[PDB]
């Protein structure tokens, strides 16, 4: 599992469960091609998005659907989504964890990158 | 001034100076149309992007060119850029400040929406 | 004004208004001596805490009374208060801004140190 | 394990390893009594600080020695340490994860609180 997403809720002090995540990859013609998607589990984690073989070098966008999360909880938030855009695997395969901490009018995202 | 951008540097403990910022508005065909842009000042701020007349309700994207900022400082960063995507609403308060606090592998953004 | 405190609310997307802030200086016996205090203004800021003459090198603690803030808004918070502990140094720039961004179960603090 | 500490480094995009952590508990006479201490592992985690029996109700302070972390890496940071102060177990036993994301002039801390 070379791409994992972890989401926390800063209002409840809990994992952010059932958060939809869509990953895109920049194609040769410079558009955002859909790459993988999923939703966070009861632990606020999303595993199984892709494989080492399919997660080739490229520029990736991880869109975390924060508005859809907050609205399903009946709250009106500020952002449409949190976007995390990065070049991956350009020095060989790595494992990436994208973490996000959510509030209704704010979020903070960090990457943990490890070398198998 | 209905839209301001403030950028801080969490490594140096300073404003983030001369950071390029591009603002886009979502068009009817879901493409991102250029709207306004500039570079942050010595105080890490970018004022004068738009006017109340032009800043109508809709979805906007503020792209902060963090990669160039870190590279100019000789530091290797993670993100291509920081992105802040939000709906402008006339119901709420009138002035939007988008603030971003930058680290090489992490950022933190909030909205301060006031009258 | 060598020391300013700025407090933001990440739930409401606003300055955090009327938040009590207490600043202490570490004494020779390692106790915390009261130094200055106030409440944030309508812009979430607290100015006028000290003077350049009084703000000598040393270790300071800025305590932000976040628990009372959240309770006044009818929200149940995690932390008793937010604490920012740092050394003032004459070598670096002259003006310290301690900023804090508050959520019920989380905060984010940075220092903006300028001339 | 009812009290766990997780620390990340926002400069390196990695766990913050070998970070010293000291936990204190407010005593009846209102001073900070030493309660437990340890240091983060290669995964940036600190387990085994206390037990369910010993982690009674009280006000706790988790001091994360960020200055000692940054200086051991040869960098001069702003804060002395990050302090996380909270009432614990006042509605019965809970499990607490205190997470912190570190930069030289900034940090962000969050709590994840779960009910066994
Ligand atoms: O830089 S200043 O001295 O102007 O002080 C300010 C003024 C201001 O509007 C905002 C801020 C800080 C915002 C901020 C944003 C995200 C975080 O995770 C933490 C803090 C600091
Ligand atoms: O507390 S947990 O059990 O969720 O453990 C984890 C695991 C993990 O990959 C990340 C985190 C915290 C990340 C985090 C991210 C951004 C912030 O501004 C503050 C904290 C916490």
- Ligand 2 centre distance from Cα of residue A65 (Å): 18
Determination technique used: X-ray
A54-87 CB burial, b ≥16 within 10 A, e <16: ebeebbbbbbbbbbebbeeeeeebbbbbbbbbbe
The pair of structure tokens assigned to B108 is 């933190």
> Of B94, B96, B34, B80, which is closest to residue B61 (Cα–Cα)?
B34
D35-47 CB burial, b ≥16 within 10 A, e <16: bbebebeeebbbe
> Of C5, C68, C84, C1, which is closest to residue C37 (Cα–Cα)?
C5
Inter-CA distances, D29 with C32, D25, D46, D87, Å: 17, 11, 29, 16
- Calculate how close chain C gets to A85, using CA atoms only, in Å: 22
Q: B15 pairs with which residues across the strands?
A: B8
The pair of structure tokens assigned to D7 is 């620390």
Q: Give Cα B6 to chain centroid, integer Å.
A: 7
* Alpha helices per DSSP H over chain C: 66-72
DSSP state of C67: H
DSSP-derived secondary structure for B36-101: EEEE--TTSEE--S--TTT--SEEEEEEE-HHHHHHHTT---SEEEEEEEEEE-SSS-SEEEEEEE
Contacts of C114 in chain B (CB under 8 A): 14-15
Q: Is D91 left (phi over 0), alpha (psi -120 to 50) or beta?
A: alpha
Cα torsion A86, A90, A94, A98 to 10°: value is 0
Hey, whose CA ends up nearest to atom 11 of ligand 1? C99
Q: Is residue C6 lining ligand 1, measured as CB closer than 6 Å?
A: yes
E strands, chain C, in order: 3-9, 14-15, 20-26, 32-39, 45-46, 58-64, 79-88, 95-103, 106-114
Token pair 């009812």 in the structure block, residue: D2
**Which atom of ligand 1 lies at the shortest distance from residue B15's CA?**
1
Burial tier of B50 (Cβ tally within 10 Å: 0-12, 13-18, 19+): middle
Domain that holds residue C115: 1-115
Q: Are A86 and B78 in contact (CB under 8 A)?
A: yes
3-state secondary structure of B19: coil
Q: Are C95 and C113 in contact (CB under 8 A)?
A: yes
- Calculate how close chain D gets to A89, using CA atoms only, in Å: 15
Q: Is residue A6 lining ligand 2, measured as CB closer than 6 Å?
A: yes
Q: What is the CA radius of gyration of chain C?
A: 14
Q: Which of B44, B62, B99 to mutate to test the pocket of ligand 1 (most atoms within 8 A of CB)?
A: B99
Phi, psi at C89, each rounded to 5°: -130, 130
C45 belongs to an annotated ligand binding site: yes
Q: Are D36 and D50 in contact (CB under 8 A)?
A: yes
Q: Quick check: C106 and A10 CB within 8 A?
A: yes
DSSP state of A9: E
Burial tier of C56 (Cβ tally within 10 Å: 0-12, 13-18, 19+): exposed
CA distance B109 to B34: 21
CA distance B110 to D24: 32
The pair of structure tokens assigned to C6 is 């700025």
- Chain A neighbors (3+ CB pairs < 8 Å): B, C, D
Report which secondary-structure segment, H or E, holds D67: helix D66-72
Q: Is residue A110 lining ligand 2, measured as CB closer than 6 Å?
A: yes
Q: Which of B79, B106, B107, B109 to mutate to test the pocket of ligand 2 (most atoms within 8 A of CB)?
A: B106
CA distance C53 to A57: 56
The pair of structure tokens assigned to D61 is 């302070």
Q: Quick check: B13 and D108 CB within 8 A?
A: no
CA distance B85 to B83: 6
The pair of structure tokens assigned to D60 is 């706790």
**Which atom of ligand 2 lies at the shortest distance from residue A43's CA?**
4
Resolution (A): 1.4
Angle at B86 between CA B81 and CA B89, to 5 degrees: 155
D45 belongs to an annotated ligand binding site: yes
Would you tell me how many other CB atoms lie within 10 Å of the CB of residue B59?
15
CA distance A54 to C33: 60
Q: Chain D residue closest to B11 (CA)?
A: D104
E strands, D20-75, in order: 20-26, 32-39, 45-46, 58-64
- Calculate how close chain C gets to D4, using CA atoms only, in Å: 16
On the CB side of D76, how many CA atoms lie within 13 Å of its CA?
6
Q: Are D82 and D99 in contact (CB under 8 A)?
A: no
**Which atom of ligand 1 lies at the shortest distance from residue B112's CA?**
9
B8, B15, B110 member nearest C8 (Cβ): B110
3-state secondary structure of C79: strand
The pair of structure tokens assigned to C77 is 């918070």
Q: Are D15 and A115 in contact (CB under 8 A)?
A: no
Pairing of strands B106-114, C32-39: unpaired
Contacts of B107 in chain A (CB under 8 A): 108-109
Inter-CA distances, A109 with A7, B80, B100, B103, D48, Å: 9, 14, 11, 10, 28
Burial tier of D11 (Cβ tally within 10 Å: 0-12, 13-18, 19+): buried
3-state secondary structure of D16: coil
On the CB side of C73, how many CA atoms lie within 13 Å of its CA?
18
CA distance C55 to C35: 9
Would you tell me how many other CB atoms lie within 10 Å of the CB of residue C6?
19
Q: Chain B residue closest to D78 (CA)?
A: B13
- Chain C neighbors (3+ CB pairs < 8 Å): A, B, D
CATH of the domain at D103: 2.60.40.180
CA distance C58 to C35: 12
- Ligand 2 centre distance from Cα of residue A8 (Å): 7
Cα torsion D3, D8, D14, D16 to 10°: value is -70
Contacts of B111 in chain A (CB under 8 A): 78-79, 105-106
> Of C80, C68, C72, which is closest to residue C105 (Cα–Cα)?
C80
> Of A64, A76, A74, which is closest to residue A39 (Cα–Cα)?
A64
B11, B12, B108 member nearest D108 (Cβ): B108
Q: How many domains does chain C have?
A: 1
Q: Are A112 and C21 in contact (CB under 8 A)?
A: no
CA distance D88 to D38: 19
Q: Are B109 and B62 in contact (CB under 8 A)?
A: no
On the CB side of C95, how many CA atoms lie within 13 Å of its CA?
13
The pair of structure tokens assigned to D17 is 């390893």
B13, B104, B108 member nearest D11 (Cβ): B104
Contacts of B78 in chain D (CB under 8 A): 13
D39 belongs to an annotated ligand binding site: no
DSSP-derived secondary structure for A47-81: --S--TTT--SEEEEEEE-HHHHHHHTT---SEEE
Mutate to test the interface with A, among B11, B80, B107 (most CBs of A within 10 A): B80
């Amino acid at each position: 599992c070379p791409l994992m997403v972890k989401v926390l809720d800063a209002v409840r002090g809990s994992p952010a469960i059932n958060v939809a995540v869509h990953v895109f990859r920049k194609a040769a013609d410079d558009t955002w091609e859909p790459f993988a998607s999923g939703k966070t589990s009861e632990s606020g984690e999303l595993h199984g998005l892709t494989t080492e073989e399919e997660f080739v070098e490229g520029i990736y966008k991880v869109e975390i659907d924060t508005k859809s999360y907050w609205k399903a909880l009946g709250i009106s938030p500020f952002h449409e989504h949190a976007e995390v855009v990065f070049t991956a695997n350009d020095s060989g395969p790595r494992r990436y964890t994208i973490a996000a901490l959510l509030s209704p009018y704010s979020y903070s995202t960090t990457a943990v990158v490890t070398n198998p």
